[PDB]
Symmetry: C3
Subunit: 601 residues, 3 copies
């Protein structure tokens, strides 16, 4: 029972040096794995990882749960809620859960069935520090120490482009000069290279002003440079964790790994319907191709029966594994996708404003089956949201809500509190717009943007950005520039010794599961305002990444054109919207005073 | 992929013409069925209906779920809640769900087992419009278009008696002159006649004053007239939907329908215990008759076994179907009910005030096994409820809460948030009292009425009205007149070519499932303050409806007599209640000022 | 259908006489059992007990649920919440549920499997009365009348040491002079003696001042005297209930009782592994002894198989029953515990302050596997909690929150709203500290204490007290005296005619299930500040109880020594903490005014 430590020195040159220190051995010793991460021995995050005694094979996927507990005492304050106790998690907590879950989930060895839970508690917080990227490393560390079969350690860092430099673990003070804020997580390969696994980035509310005053705008080139600048830090963080795990020398428990299907079933099924299935997947029409598929499912379920009694869960798994191979295979060879499109083809677009009566502003955006309705509401600043969390942010002038109803994909389901996904997609589309919003003084209004995903099948979040841009303009909000988004995919196949890469524009929901990389990009004509990436690939050639981003950029620019035909400049503010510039009875206006339906002079 | 429209022109003569316009084809195309309904192209409600891929036969009933999503942006305002996002549904939303569910649920072909969900979103709302009846039609339309086996279309309308005229889809401005507000939903029969399926009506806070100044009080006769005035509008709405569905020409999916039991089992069981069961149902005593029943259940479960192995779910279903027939049969032939009562007999009554110590006012009402405790609390107006929804109502001086605990019917269960039923019954009993309350100026108090259903078995909601009247009077609230309620039932059987009708006074819970029509009526000695009806019957003779309402009226008047013996005029306001008419320390009163335990001069 | 009554006269001599009156027959007649309890015909609590029709044998334990419904109308006020309706239960309600559940659950005949629910509603409350102990008796009464197999009636009373006298059912007015407040519940044995089953006691905020002015401090001796003074009242309450049940003469339903295992399996298993298991339990090392156990589980599961097919649930139950006997047996004979300790040995201790950076105050307390992190936060009084319940308490200057995460015991689980246990343990540790806190005027700060149970296995609540004392001192809070706690156990075995008693110091979680009595004690060096007890024993010798409490006292004093080495006197208040003693902009301080980071002169 001894305490072990390890440090990751982060050198930012003229901006100073900081340290992420890891600890294990004194806190939460009953958990399978436990670790603490400090940022300059000031901010502190405790992470505990536990696993169920027995595997939960009654499931088809890996059950991982991430929870982030924000403790108000970390900021030296008593919770302001009526119950004086912190309750339902803040937006930051939920977003941090996802930042942790995204790279962690895939890291676990395929087949694992034990239920895994990770709980990160923010116990001490220097008001000038950002805890999210500290929690990522703590979550990785505790999991590494739990003796769980996963490709750890995972290093998480934030790099922001401040005065031409990519500063690691920037502080709020430093972020005042950032043109781009980017969170990156990766692992170290056996050859020593760093493999990037997750990216969550955005431009800032300072970007346009900084660029105007001299800073370099964040384009695809700059963003890619930021990714390279992140690797050295990630390596240091992973090394520090590996050192911690080596010192702790915890035991590697016995965790069973299950197969989706034994080889016999895959060989049987293939031999039974490989040519038919291959032919069926050539049918572009969705409902027309789904006909054949439901049929070949019989021709197969017939031949392999009753030879395989009670091996259904295996024939299905194999049936998907097979479909996946054939489809990927066809994209590389024939260069055609499952819906008939070519690698750079965007589904049918459609844009229009004034989609809903009475509301301050609205827009309808369509891209294939993905349909997003955006609605804008403008009220006086006294309606802006008030926040009391472990964040310096206390008010929010621009609010975005993303709704994803079950009927969006033709099914039934709970209609209530927003899920973690809604929070995530909502946040990304929110961050994509923030950089082009007018200032509080230029436009004295609390702004609430709502995106209703009425139809879904391919990045509703990116579609949510486009609908937001138009809806806001339709409402009369003077945006500094319009913003559009697109969701890409990438296929990496090694065809006889050599590796082939293919970037797919505007991927369908299914193309996500078939691919090796998933990235989303939003921005104006000049630069990137939001970027999201996820992959397991050991890495891809600089030229491939550049080409994929350039392709994505081309798609974004086309979409901005379609959008501009619907609306170019802000519209005349709706009459229903208030006009902002005793007496509140005489003038009929509530006092910066306005509260006038429009008249009031 | 084209957009289709259809219109229902509502002609209100001197009050103007308005239009409910239906649309389908551009919004939410992934749902089984989708439709939009506009009221004067201003107020807008989107409705989407979805169904589960596979039936859910593991259930005994039809699983339908209705959700009403109120979007604050429809009123051009940012949600006022701390989270600036709309959350748990308002009372109006829940009540609208029920207005939709009541006529829709029965409309589905018996046997359907797929899970069905309907989601209506209020997207645009003219502050002078009422969205509930617009949502009803939208819900019907989307469902009709989903290709689901149901007796659509269902037309929903509101008719209010304004200046001698029944105005369809009245506005808040017009409702200022209404003596009766009535929501009605129905369908069009093959012969072209309209069959009314649901009614939700009430008198208003203006009724007594209007009648005093000349208007005609809403009696059984007037109410029946209102129902007739509703039919023409319902027909126009159904026609508009049928026209929409015809234009859309969506496909009629393959939805399986299941039988509760095959005929063999019903014929077997009947032949096995028909005479015994028939005899057992003649025993008036509940616990004494339930003895025989549990026995004949054996004599039968014996003979039909093991001849029917694994056919239990069928023997039970058949056993109920059989009981139902025998019981109905006996009511018509012998004119006697399952508990020994005659068609017009009211169960044993009991009324008393001062049932609970200390509280401002209380009353205990008993009618058979139904027992309701009512408790009144009086506070200063600053305690009245504040509301921020899609309704013009911002404050509520009179609040009614209805609690239905599991032990109310001898069972265990969740004790927490109020269910949709509690909201519904609570609302109906609330609306029944509102018309006789003193004005804000006559009685400057926030009033909270709570009804505890301590015993249940036959309209606790109607019993809730009676307890409210007495409790309020016991507290010293000067009601303009006392209110009482009664729950009726109706049996319609075609005995050899001709159809027989029998109205049942104060029905038991079981008599609800045995009947063909269920209606509840509340009111003073002079008129109706609340009415609720549900049926599937193609329609009943004018004279039958009139007779049923007259019977119900007789019952209501008898109950008012029993109530008046307990309390006639308001009592002396309790000393514990406050008296309303720096200095708040000197006078000991908080300032219209009172805040005095009674003294303060 | 008649109403029955019975009274329990409580004679407090010079302090007056009060009465608890029971009633049954008029309210909630559909519940299996129903009863009302009045305190001086003023305060009123209705209790209804219901049971599921069919037993729920798919469970291993008895499913009992207690709910306490606080009705604001009982105090003559409209709920202050936004929804003007009472919602999620107050702390008092949850604590009252536990006061009821603790003695009631064990009272049910072993083997019962029907789901039982008890709902107590507070309908009328004299502001000077405490309803908790009234609800206890009402819950007992309704359950007794339900004809359920349980050792009723259970009498609940509160005795407070006021001016040298133990006053029964004290009022808030009288509690102003109490040095000790103690809730006790018990039953009457056939010989007429009272058997105490549950105790929940605490010193008060008045204790130290009263003692200084002459009153006798509450030591082990005084506390024991209070227990004796409680028995006469308990007897009167039980007699009153028995009289009520006799008058009601309700029927005793047919409730099946199930066996955990038939005798054959226990005799088989014993003969198969009794000597091995007995040997295995001699291994002190946890992981080393769990090796043998998992093995003998085979040697047994082997011999008894396949002789016992489908009798697993029985072999397991028997395996525990056997382990329990052997372990208890060894403690009495050899005087050694399952972890190798002796009856008076305390596990390894460890204490330290300044455990977390930045926070106002913190401390880490360890006792065996039980590890508690305590964190203190100090804010201005405007941050104190505001309360609006059926209690005279409207503000809370000292707040304690107890968190028990799943990883605390190495497992996964829900991380959200606090469970009833957290509320209970949180409350007990809160009450243990309240008596030594500085006054509002001496220390003008709102204080929030949080205990994180990072490791658990033996009274985290008592460990929570110790961490609170140190954490508060570390923050600079001038406590009048330090407080420590310890959890005891007691084993009662009749070895050949005579009964042997053995008190165990600092019991492990398992030692709780093996014992016959569980008690926790906290306090300073001078007296007891909190006491908690639970047992089913018919009673224990005065000398045994005294000896157990003296042993517990010795343990508490040792722990206070270890704590004092870590911190003795309060520390210098943290700089991050605020200092309390237009202009709020000039002085930078918010106005008793302070709001200064420290400077402000």
């Amino acid at each position: 029972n001894e305490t072990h430590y390890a440090e990751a020195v982060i050198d930012n040159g003229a901006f100073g040096t900081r340290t992420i220190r890891f600890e294990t051995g004194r806190l939460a010793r009953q958990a399978a794995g436990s670790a603490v991460a400090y940022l300059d021995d000031d901010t502190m995050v405790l992470s505990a990882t536990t696993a169920s005694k027995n595997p939960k094979d009654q499931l088809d996927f890996f059950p991982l749960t991430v929870d982030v507990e924000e403790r108000m005492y970390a900021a030296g304050k008593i919770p302001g809620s009526f119950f004086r106790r912190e309750g339902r998690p803040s937006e930051d907590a939920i977003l941090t859960c996802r930042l942790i879950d995204r790279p962690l989930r895939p890291s676990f060895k395929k087949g694992l069935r034990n239920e895994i839970q990770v709980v990160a508690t923010i116990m001490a917080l220097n008001p000038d520090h950002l805890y999210d990227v500290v929690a990522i490393n703590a979550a990785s560390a505790s999991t590494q120490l739990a003796g769980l079969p996963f490709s750890g350690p995972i290093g998480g860092v934030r790099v922001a482009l401040i005065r031409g430099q990519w500063v690691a673990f920037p502080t709020h003070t430093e972020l005042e000069d950032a043109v781009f804020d980017m969170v990156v997580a990766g692992r170290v390969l056996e050859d020593g290279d760093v493999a990037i696994m997750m990216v969550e980035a955005e431009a800032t509310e300072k970007t346009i002003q900084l660029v105007k005053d001299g800073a370099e705008a964040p384009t695809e080139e700059v963003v890619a440079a930021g990714l390279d600048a992140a690797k050295p830090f990630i390596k240091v963080l992973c090394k520090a964790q590996a050192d911690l795990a080596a010192k702790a020398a915890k035991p590697t428990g016995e965790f069973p790994v299950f197969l989706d299907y034994q080889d016999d079933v895959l060989e049987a099924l293939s031999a039974a319907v490989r040519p038919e299935l291959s032919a069926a997947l050539t049918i572009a029409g969705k409902q027309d191709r789904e006909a054949e598929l439901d049929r070949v499912k019989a021709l197969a379920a017939e031949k392999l029966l009753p030879e395989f009694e009670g091996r259904e869960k295996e024939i299905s798994a194999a049936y998907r594994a097979l479909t996946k191979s054939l489809v990927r295979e066809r994209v590389i060879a024939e260069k055609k996708r499952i819906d008939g499109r070519g690698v750079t083809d965007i589904r049918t677009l459609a844009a229009e404003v004034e989609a809903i009566p009475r509301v301050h502003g609205s827009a309808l955006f369509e891209r294939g089956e993905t349909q997003i309705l955006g609605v804008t509401t403008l009220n006086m600043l006294r309606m802006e949201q008030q926040l009391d969390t472990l964040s310096p942010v206390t008010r929010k002038r621009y609010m975005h809500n993303y709704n994803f109803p079950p009927y969006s994909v033709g099914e039934t389901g709970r209609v209530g509190s927003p899920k973690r996904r809604e929070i995530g997609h909502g946040a990304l589309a929110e961050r994509a717009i923030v950089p082009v919003l007018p200032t509080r003084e230029e436009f004295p209004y609390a702004i609430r943007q709502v995106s209703e995903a009425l139809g879904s099948n391919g990045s509703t979040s990116m579609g949510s950005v486009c609908a937001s841009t138009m809806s806001l303009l339709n409402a009369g909000v003077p945006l500094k520039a319009p913003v559009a988004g697109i969701a890409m995919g990438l296929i990496s196949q090694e065809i006889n010794g050599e590796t082939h890469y293919v970037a797919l524009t505007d991927i369908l929901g299914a193309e996500d599961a078939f691919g090796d990389m998933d990235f989303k990009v939003a921005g104006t004509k000049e630069f990137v305002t939001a970027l999201q990436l996820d992959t397991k690939l050991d890495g891809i050639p600089a030229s491939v990444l550049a080409a994929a981003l350039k392709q994505a950029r081309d798609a974004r620019l086309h979409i901005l054109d379609v959008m501009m035909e619907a609306i170019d400049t802000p519209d005349e503010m709706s009459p229903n919207a208030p006009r902002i510039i005793q007496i509140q009875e005489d003038t009929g206006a509530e006092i910066y005073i306005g509260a006038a339906d429009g008249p009031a002079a």
